[PDB]
């Protein structure tokens, strides 16, 4: 981290990204809907997008795409490789600026 926030909700992440973030700000947090797992909260166009991270026990990924041994390697990969996450239509979801 410090893009990793161990004790926030999706709501609390929204509030943080909206008040202390800029467009391209992001963080990872524990998932509500999958206990024990993680979710990326990403600000783009003044709003927040959430994306689940899968942990299979053998790797992490985004329920698709490249496989990683650790959450930090996942985050680094998508920070370094811009334009790998997209809406189907067709703007990019960029992890630009960790929110620490």
């Amino acid at each position: 981290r410090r893009w990793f926030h161990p004790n926030i909700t999706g709501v609390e992440a929204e509030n943080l990204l909206l008040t202390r973030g800029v467009d391209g700000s992001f963080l990872a947090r524990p998932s509500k809907s999958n206990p024990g797992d993680f979710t990326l909260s990403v600000r783009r166009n003044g709003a927040v997008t959430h994306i689940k991270i899968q942990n299979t026990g053998d790797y992490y990924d985004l329920y698709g795409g490249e496989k990683f041994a650790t959450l930090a390697e996942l985050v680094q990969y998508y920070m370094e490789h811009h334009g790998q996450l997209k809406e189907k239509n067709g703007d990019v979801i960029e992890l630009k600026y960790p929110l620490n």
Binding site: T49, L62, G65, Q84, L85, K86, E87
Partner: peptide, 6 residues
Amino acid sequence: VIYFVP
């Protein structure tokens, strides 16, 4: 790349 939808 990965494409996403709500």
